[model samples]
Structures are given as C-alpha cells and as structure tokens.
Target: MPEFVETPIPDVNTLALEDIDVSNPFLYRQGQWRAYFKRLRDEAPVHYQKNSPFGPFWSVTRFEDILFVDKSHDLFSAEPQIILGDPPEGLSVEMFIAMDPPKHDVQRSSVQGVVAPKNLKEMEGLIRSRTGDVLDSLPTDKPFNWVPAVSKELTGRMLATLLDFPYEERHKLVEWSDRMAGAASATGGEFADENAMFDDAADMARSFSRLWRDKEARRAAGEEPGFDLISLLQSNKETKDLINRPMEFIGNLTLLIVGGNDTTRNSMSGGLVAMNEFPREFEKLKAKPELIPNMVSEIIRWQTPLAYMRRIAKQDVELGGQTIKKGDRVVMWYASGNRDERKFDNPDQFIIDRKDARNHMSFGYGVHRCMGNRLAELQLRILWEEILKRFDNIEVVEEPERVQSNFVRGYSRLMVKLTPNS
Candidate 1:
C-alpha cells in the first residue's frame, strides 16, 4: 500500500479514469492527463484504482514510484503478465518488455545485436539518407499530416532497413506501420472493444505474412541481408526461430513499427509545438543551431510520448502504506512523472537549455528502457536540424487530432503551414 503524503489512498476498485490516450487532444487540447496526473501526484502517488470502462488497474502516478516499480522486477514481473490485464481481446501475451529477468534478458539480447550502438553506428549513413529522402518527399511549404508525411515515412524506412525489405515497394512500409498501429481506428474501431483489437492483431499478421515468407527464404538460402536488423534476427539461431514463432513475430513487428513510429513522430511534433509555443526558444535555436543536440534532449523530455507503461504486481506488498495485492496491474504514468514539480523546476515550461532535461522518464527506466532511444534522438535531431536550416516558421493552421489509445500519446492528425525562408 504505497501512498503519497497529501492524498488519501482511494480504494483501488472505485477510481474512475478519464480517457487519457496519447493523442494531442488528451495531451495538448483537452488536457485530460495533466488534470488526472495533477490529482494523482497531489492526492495519491501510488494509487490503486479500478474502473468499469476498462476494468481494474493500479495507477502508479509519481515519477519515483514508477522508477521503483520498474527497477524492482522481482516484485513487479512483466512477463506472462500484462499492463492493463489481458484485454479480453486486444493485446495477447506480453512481449519482451513484459518479461522479467532471465527470460527478458534472453529475448532482448537476441534482438539487441541488430540495434545496439555498434549496429546503429553501422546503419548511420543509411538512416541519415533515408531520413533525408522522407523529408524530401514533403513540400517546402504546405500543410500535411506530419505523422504520415514525415514520421511514418522515416520510421517505415527504418523498419524497411530492419526487415531488409525490398527497395521497390518502399512506399508501402507506412501502410504496414499504420495497420500495426490501429487499422481498427481507420475502420472506426479506435474506441471499440477487446475483440476488435484481437482482430487488428490478426490483420497485422496477414499484413506481415509476405515479409515473413521472404525472410524465411533469405534464411533458407543462407544468404544474409548484410548488416540490417532483420538479418541479425534471421542469422541468429535463437532469434530466427523466435522471429518465426506464433503471433509473436507479428506482435514483435507491430511493436517495432508502433514503437518506432509513434515515439519519433510525437517527438517531432512536440519539438515543433515547443518551438511554436516558445518562439524565443525557436529563435535561440535558429541563431545558435549548434545547440540542436541539447534541444533534442529537451524536446524528448517535453514530449515523453510513450507516456506510462504498466507492470503487474507478483504478490501483495505494502508501498507507501497502501496494499497492492498480488496479480494487480499497475500503470506507471510517465507523462505525469515527467511533470512532477518535486523533481523539476517549472516542470510545465519548455526550456531547451535545461541541464536535467535528459533525466526525464519519457523513455522509462531500468533494463526495459527504450531500446531505440538513440535512434529516436538521431531521427529527431536530423529532421529538426534540417527544418531549422530550411524553413523560417510553421504554424498549426488547424487543431490537431489525437489518437484514441491509452497506450500511445501523440498527434494523429496535425495540419500546419510552413512559411519558407525566415
């Protein structure tokens, strides 16, 4: 039973949640999460609360509490466990992020060969070129769905490189990424129930089928695809089999696409939003473009797109005087934690020069911290650097629409006009 100093521990089963998905509305416009987290930080930091809309869940509010739960894996195992419980339909068994200790290490290690610093270093030139091409596709001055126009293409290209996907149909990569994100939302299922989500997973498998087949061929031919990510997985005996097994492959690919896709997109959009919100900061960057690296860190801190990822309690435990029963699903809201005034000065304000910007939990903590953090930063820095060089200013001409997902936080539909040559 963990409890904050000021707020009373509300009964876990009785708490209500405002739909605080990752979309811009929840984060930017409606401000549902800010309000919810303010209450959580003030009233109950490690509060356990349940709801009818999505059933029971423990909301881990404070930043330090989340770090505590994230680091103490034995008490809060990720595998065979779920974030918000096995939604009678959407997500199946938890992936590597959900696993604990030995198994978690084994699975994660298998994939790390492809993405570790060394590999990313090798992939740098390709990543930079691909990033440029994606940006080149966008007009110099116009309104566009930055998610698809920029972030999706960049991430999709990254996925293609990872999969060793054929070069001809490179454009279709974003479609695959979108299907993995939520084809249901495209088909009007954003707010739908669990079964529809399971169906979405099925659709993802169908979508991934071709790639799976080609990957098998490459593996059988014993011809590696070079230093690409898929090759690393395909070449490794352990991961090759793991990659081919069950819906796990589909789940893994979907996770990669979404994980890679949303985080970078939100970071990009958030960077732009930050620039617009604080024009002085924007001018500072324009005048001293060398500071873009530090700016990237601040932007990630400001965006913290992945928001809070959850973990389930292995057994009953007393935390901050509140009792967390065994098998309880606890969600650590990183969005709230990043804004904790206790940890940051003027938490809401965006300050690019802030020294502690990189210390934020937008990327979580512990072993399961984002595997592609550097990649995300590289992508964002390159793009923003280019934007600074190319455009004078860009403004949001229309209100941005957000995705209706509790899992991700970002802009789904953001329209803006860029004024060239500042």
Candidate 2:
C-alpha cells in the first residue's frame, strides 16, 4: 500500500493546519475534509506540505487567497497538470483548461458556442424535457440510488446532445469521464487501480478517435455538420487539425466530457443531499420556491465539486506570508475557500438564499473559470424547479457514499425515496 492510500482520522480541532497533511485524499474519502479545511482557513490559509504522496505542494485555503491565485494567470500557470497527481506517461492529454494564453484562448474558443447565451436559450427547453422524463421515471415509495437515476442520467444525456454523440451510446460519456477524472485524481480508486487507469485512457482515446473520423468524413462530403461539440471543433480553424494530433485530441475530448459531466452531476447530487441534511433550508425553499436560483448557487458552493485545481508557479511570488518559488506546485483548495468564514457568513451552514451565493469559487476565477458555469447553473435551477413541482419530499435513506477523489467533491450513491406532491 502506498503512503497516500490511507490516512488515519484524527481529532480535527486539535491538529494544527501545518501538522496535518491536507494533500491526503483519505481526508476527503472519509468525509472529514470540513474539519481539515476549517483548520487551514482558521490558522494557515496558505500552508505548505513538504512531503505528500503527490510531492511537495502549497495549499491556498482561504477565499480571498484562492481568488488571488486563480485570477493571477501571469503569476500562476495552469500548464503541465491541474490535479494533485503526477501526469501519467503517454496519457497526459493537453486540454485548453491546463494551458495558458494564446493557445488556450484559441482552443477554448473552438467550442465556446455550445454554451453561449443564444445556445443556452435554445437548450433550456430540451434540458427541461429531459429533466421531466428522468424525474418522472424515478422509483417512488422505495429507496433507490439518486446518483444514477437523476444526477448521472440527466447530465449524461445533456453531454451526449452537446457532443452530438450517438444517443444510444451516451452512457459511454459518463464511463469515460469517470475513468479519466478518477485516473487523474488522487482518489480514483473507485474506477480502477493506478495501473489500469492509463489503459482506460488509451481505450477512451481510440473510441473518440473513431468519432472524429466520422465527423471529418461528413465534412469532407460537403455535409453541414450540426452544432454539436465535434462539429464545432471540426469546423473551427484552430482545432480542425486537432484530430491529427492524437494525444491533443484525446486530451481535449476528455476535458470537454469530464467538464460537462462531473461538475453538474455532482452538484445535482450534492443539492439533494444538502436539502436532506439541512431540512430547514429545504422548508424555506419549499415555501419560497422562487429562491431556487439562489439555492442553486448555494448548493454548488456547499458541494464545491472539483475540490481543488493545481497550478505550477511560473515565478517566485509572495502569497499569504510565504514566499513561493518558481516550479512549485500550488493547489487552490476551492472546497476550503468556499467555506471561508471571512467570505461567506455562516459558512458552514447551507443557506438557500445566500445573498452573495453566486460569488463562490467553485467555477474558479478569471481566465481559467469554467466556461460551462452558466449552463450548469441553468441545469440545476431547472431541475430544482421541476423537482419542487413534482415531489413533496425526497427522503434520504442513508448517508451518501462519496467519491474518494479529493478533486471531485461528489457522491457515488445517495439512497432516497421520493414522495409525490400531495
């Protein structure tokens, strides 16, 4: 067993931030991250872990401090890798999210139209229809796993439509994304062991490459491609040749799939869990259903899906009373930053109508901010609207089985029984 494999749970309140190894994925897997993050926020917002399974990295845990790092693209670069784990050989896909400046801009712009305002307006009705169908099919009066029934199904469908992927094989989107994220994440044990992860990535690359060829063939025959992600990449001048570069194509494909899949699905699951855990807030929402939009933001904040993003320091810089040298790995712990008492009042509690709820760091800050953020918020808002109209109560039967990955703050299983409106 590796040193990072497991960590003994300690008395969180008694341990100082510096003494604790925040990089340990076990803290997250065991669902004891709140206490660890609380200690970091209260004591050392920017702390260093000299020895971690992933190597030495600096942890920026406060809200303001994370913003400072996230927004300063010049000071902190997203190159090389974005998670805590080291890049696996031959499987390091170079997506725009991990690149800086000109190249990043060009590649990101390729598929920006998919989530554009106009496109979102067009997508809303379809999204709601799918949400309705998924919700209507839920097994009522009996405990069922909400993770797949609602969260994964809804997002998986949306991802398929966005990519113009074969609807029948849409489930592959989630499978590939889960593996890619898990493989690259510190807590990917849920999918496969470390050795098998790369093999999975290679398989995903081959599968997506087949899709690229089909898309290219359509374009070659003078067919006007639909507005799916593949069409956009195929049509765009910047990414038209992306297919020629196998690794780069695989990288971007994985990026778009994982980006579209994980965050929204987990937020959906997290929102439900939050409502069940904080019944008063759920009651407040039930009374004033209009607060759903704000509640959407609150849930994302509360969950902080995609817990942390790693950045390699481009140059020596001073941050949070520490001098960081170039070439050091800096992890912006968004999960901790979202719950910072300084930024959000009653940070620990889930407030349905938190006034500044949209100001959370879950979507990140500045240039590298998540492009699909608005779309995600839209999906959650619509789901809740539909949920409120249909179900009187969604009773959580047990504590959720959380994904072990420190990067993705998500649930694997949430047993719930839905009772229709009276």
Candidate 3:
C-alpha cells in the first residue's frame, strides 16, 4: 500500500537541477544516492525542490552548512517532526528530537544517562558476551544473511538490556520499532500498513505501561532499582511520573527504540559492506585490532546511517548562499556531508584509520546529537573484537538489499559466508 512504489532513478546528470528530488525512498535502494549527492554538493549545496513528494523543502548538502543548521537552534527548529514528510493524518506522536530548547533538554537529559559513558562502561562486558554469543551461533559452512543473524540479533539483544525488556521477547522490540518507523507517510519507507502500525503502537503503549507499573511496584517494595532507561527516567524529577503522560511516555520510548535500532543496526550492516568494498581497510583492522575503536567511527562515517535530519527554518536565514524562508523545511543531508570532498581527502573511500573520524556527521551535531552514540560505538567495537577473535573473513555473497527509506540507510538482507580463523 505504499503510495510511492519502486521506479528507476535516473542518473544525476540526466535530470535537470530542479528535477532532482532525493526524497524518493528508492534512491538509496537503487544506489543512485552517491552520484546525486555529489552533484548537489558541487552545484547546489543549498538546493530546493519545489514539488517534492514531501512538498517543498531545501536541501543543505555541504558539511559546513549542515553543521551550521544543526548548531543554530534559533535559526532552525526541530519542532513538530524531523522526517521530510508528516506522518499519516491523525497519527501524532511527540518525541524530544522534534522539540526545541528547554523542553528538549529536560526530556533528553532524563534518559540519556542510561547510555552515558559511565553506564556504557558497566554494560561493555555484557555487550561483548551477547555479541560473542550471536557470532558463535552463526553458520560458517553456508551463507547466511548477516542483517538478521548478526546485525538485528546483536542490536535486539542490546536493546533488551538497555530497556530491560524480557530477553526471550527481544525480537518483538525490533519488530515494533520497524513498524513504527517504517510508515510510508512518515519517512517514505515501505511499510504502508497503517492499521497494523497503529495496532503495534498501541501494543507498545500497553507493554511499556505494564513494565513501568511493575517497576513502580518493585521500587515501592524496597527492591533495588535497575540502571535501565525506564529506571533512569523515573529517577529524574522532571520525568518521574512519565508514565502518567501517555503520549510523551510512548513517544520517548519509541524515539529511543527507533533511534537506537536503525543507526546501530544499519552501521553493523554497512561496516561489512564497506569492508568488502575496501579489503585493505579490513587488513589494517586485522593487523591492528587497536583500530577497532577508531574504525567504529570511520564505519559510521562511511555508512552515514539515517541519511538526513530535517529541520524547519525558525526565520528567514541565509545559508549556503540560499535564503530559506521562515517555516520552510530544511533538510541537512548528513550522508552527503560525510562524503563531501571539500572536507574529506577521499570522501568515497572507507578508511579505517582516517584521521578525525570522530567528527563524522552521522551522529548529527549540537544538543540534538545522538545520545546513544557511545552506546552504538561500544556495541560495534565489541562486535568487531569478538568477530576478529572468531572469524577470518566475512565474505559478502552478493549485493545487499537496502531498506527502502530515504531516512534510514539500512540493509534488509546481506547474505555473507564466514570463514573461521585457523
């Protein structure tokens, strides 16, 4: 039921400047994004599409412009939503990423400690154990899809730990987040089952509410509080009674789940694809396992998961030589900026030891930067560490099938064969 079905995306040069609409979800799936973005960065760093499916919006393609927009909270507002399009009519959920100023700070601060550096340090060993378990269970004799087997499994397990969801039902977390974020109207994603999406959202509301009640009861019974996200939210005065507010509670929880899900999950998938594309980097990684930490950043940069973050211009602002009107949608193409030739030496290549990889735009910038960043890096580092210990090579069997969304640069299937280390 997706309104926009698959179609052949023309090369960047074939279309005139005004005909280039990057909002098409198939752009990523068709592998046309790189050339298209390259064209935009060179010709129209601040481009506008007047008749885009998501309606008129300006695209900020350069690294410096993106940083400017991301940091200038006064000039651009994240209010209402961040995706290019509005969600299906009558479906409104409020998440802090879509909020501005004091409100965003309060809500974000309440739960970010769950994935703070100190907390991630405590979870490192547990993350490693779970990652190793997943890798160990993978098949070596035959090719298997790494997307589901490793990427989804590890992240699902990690989410379970982060939210303290029942380990046995961890897959449900993945499923629910997928449905919620996969709405066709929201992000040009493939999922068009509005009815199913609504039902799943309701189910999540019920599930998290029940979990919160149980935690409240146990806390009153003098049970030691856990370090999960729910516990942290309750521990904060501002959000202590978060459950009492139905929409905010579910919205925040959904934000955390969807945020952690795609970026981490897609990064895991993209790393392998990048490695397969650049074997020298893989060899460098094999030689110096110390590079794992830095390599994680490089992978995130190369993948640039969650392609763009949309912001609304708070007022008339001059950026990249274009004056964006007040109340107009301003999309920061993080994916393009990460590959901008002006900033990066060889923007297209995957360089594991690339200097200043930490400065990647994949995590956005300023106050709204990803709170789960360290947590995502931690999971990836542990995964590679465990992988290097167990497998010699992860061979991509064929081309990957990318998720159909302009927002999330994810893989639905990456069939790969693993060779064990002798």
Candidate 4:
C-alpha cells in the first residue's frame, strides 16, 4: 500500500523570508527542502505555516511528528525559543535548546555523566587512536579538504579530549565552531564579515567567559574541578541554575561549543556527503565494517545535522489538521524528519543498510535529547572506522557548499579524492 501523495500546505502568507532566517533553514529552501519535505510528509504532518520570515512557525513535518514533538517534553517546550531567534541584541537566554522539564532534567543530568555509555567506553581506545591517527596522515592522493582534512582533525582532537582543550588551543575549538554555528553564512548585508559575525559571537562569548571564570574559580577555591562538561557544570550544585551563571555559564559554553561544533561538524560533513553521493553507499560501507554502529545511525539519518528544532507552543494544539496557537513557534524539521516518506523506506534512498536507519531524527527524540549523543556516536564510529581503514575510493571534487543556516545543516566545501589502500 505504498501509493499516496498529497502535501500542499503553503499559505502562511505564502512565506518568502521577510524575517525567518531562523539561523539557516537549510539555506532557506534551496532546491526546496526536498520538494518541501515531500509536501510535508504527504500533506501536513502537524503543520501550521505562517512565516513572513520569522514571524510565525509551526512546521513540524512527519517522522511521526518528530517523534511526537520529541516525546512531548511536557507538551512541546524547550524553555523558550529553542532555535528561532530575535536575539542579535546582546542575546539573553536559550542556550541548549531553551531548556525545560525540571530545567531539562537538571542540565541533562549534569552533562550526561560525561557522555555515558560507560563514559564512551572510557574514550574508546582514545577514540580509536584519534580516528586512526587522522587517517594515517592523509595526503595519499591529490585532492583534500574533507572538512579540514578528515573532519577537522577528528573533530578538533575530539574537542580537545572533551574540553580539556589546550593542544595549541584546539583549532580554537574548530574556529569558534564555524563562527558560532552559522558556518559560511552570508547575504545579511553580505559578509563584510557581517559585523564579523557578531565579533565572532562576542569572541565566542568571551572564550566561554574565561571558561566560566576558570570553572567558578576552581569551584570557589575548594578545588575538585577536573572532569568535563565544564567539570560537569563546575562541580555540580544539583545542576546549578541561575542559568548556570558566569554570564549564564558563558551562554552554556556558547551553547555547548556551538552544539558540539555543529553536530560533530555536520556529522563528519555527513559522512563525506554520504560517501560521495552513494558510491553504492561506499560499497555498502566497505562491505559491512561491522556496520559502523549501524553506520552511525544512517549517517545521522542522511545528515539531518541539526536542521531544525524550534518549539514554543506551550498549550492549545491540534496537529496535522492544523490549529497550533499558544505561544506558537513549532518547527522540529530535523531535515524534514530525515526525509520521512511514511517513516523511511526508500525515502530518497541512501541506505547504509537501512533497517529503519537507526530510527533517525538526527538526535532530537525526547526531552531535548542530544546531550552530545555519546559524543556524537563516538565521533561517528571513529569516523566510519577510520574511513573504512583508510579509503578505497573517496571522490567528491566539489558541490557540497550548504549551510545558509536555519540552525545547522552541514558541509561548506567537501572536495575529496582519497583512493588509497591498494
């Protein structure tokens, strides 16, 4: 029974971006969000369009309505304006998707007990020896730039061993997480360094405001500050909230280092743009390299890399047949619920063994999930097991450039070609 096509919602004054650059909405409808999420997963999967730019939002689109608004979170909330904006005026709040549910469960249970899966299995052999020593120091072939050669040196040396930082300033935390997660953005008075992107987001919020004033002056000089998640929010005081102050814990370490450097640098630039657009899904991930943990959940559901997550509506809802109004602002897209063709079967096929491709929605699934989901699947299963043990064929040569930004999509320039391992 796979034959139904409807999706025709549009009329939010036929939206045209008068103000809704909600950070980057995948470059604001380029090639029209896969035919506008295949017409909002066949006609309004909880729709309510009215977006004269950023005025009204309520899209939400399928994949079971973003898993029923990420498992209800007390009827769709993330404290306030999760990703939608108005800030630019010396920003006030909304760090870590606005936060809610008992203060998003006490700062996500005090920073998810350090990426617990037995603490990323004690940093999985130093994250597979720093992603196999950066693909054994690349340069095997000609072209390069797989997002700064092997996804920014294994996600900036795994964010310098989870913010212990310092190896020569950790690529300045991947260049201030691609300018505070508005990577390669332009056209708002087109980049004369558009106020140098708010002075590099206020010098990355004063370098995480002196790392939250040196982790609250080393937990107020009583010392005991070492483990990360900024020392689990500086020696946890039952998940210290006054918005974790230190100028709001430097806006929660500039929103957790720009959401862990833009969702692990756009899911390792979406597994090199899905292994260069499905080279037979990289020969089915080089003949099942133990399905790199289900190919890191089908490359974060084919790179749904933080595409949408806004949620405002606190009451008054209806859904699909439309009627959302309380505080309004819905959004949930997650790259249109990871291209929800009635819950993914061949939804624009890119199947790395799609047994329901890790039931994706990028990462948002329940009560603001993604507290760096096991350090973004341990940096994408050690970058697809060190790119299938250092390349068989990795070609790309251009056509990656995304991220005008309605809050993170990925890839700015991929340009690969790394065919070693003969």
Clashes of each: 16, 0, 0, 13
How do all the candidates rank in terms of TM-score, highest first? 3, 2, 1, 4
lDDT (Cα, tens digit) per residue for candidate 4, span 1-422: 01112233343335543322233244432545666555556655666556434555667778786788778877777765565644444444456567777766665566667776766787788878877887888786587777877776777777767756565788887776665444222211112244665677677666665665666776787877655666665556664453445555555555666677767877887777776677787787787788788878888888887777777878987777777888887878887778877778777677777898877878878877777877888778877777777678878887777655566666667777777786
Q: Output the lDDT of residue 165, model 4.
A: 56
Taken over the whole model, the C-alpha lDDT of each candidate is 0.68, 0.84, 0.89, 0.67
- Per-residue CA lDDT of model 3 for 244-300, tens digit only, reads 889889888888888888789999999999999998888899899999999999999
- Say which candidate scores most in lDDT: 3
The sequence of per-residue lDDT tens digits that candidate 2 reaches over residues 7-91 is 5778777765657777666566687899888877777778888876677889999999999999999899998878877655556
TM-score of each: 0.83, 0.94, 0.98, 0.34
Among all windows of ten consecutive residues in candidate 2, which has the lowest summed lDDT? 184-193
Better of 3 and 4 by lDDT: 3
**Candidate 3: where is the Cα deviation over 4 Å?**
none
Ranking, lDDT, top scorer first: 3, 2, 1, 4
Model 1, 55-129: lDDT tens digits are 466777777887898778879877653334333343554567767888778767766776777877887888777
The TM-score leader among the candidates is 3
Predicted structure 2: lDDT: 0.84
Q: Which clashing pairs does model 2 show?
A: none
Higher-ranked by lDDT: 1 or 4: 1
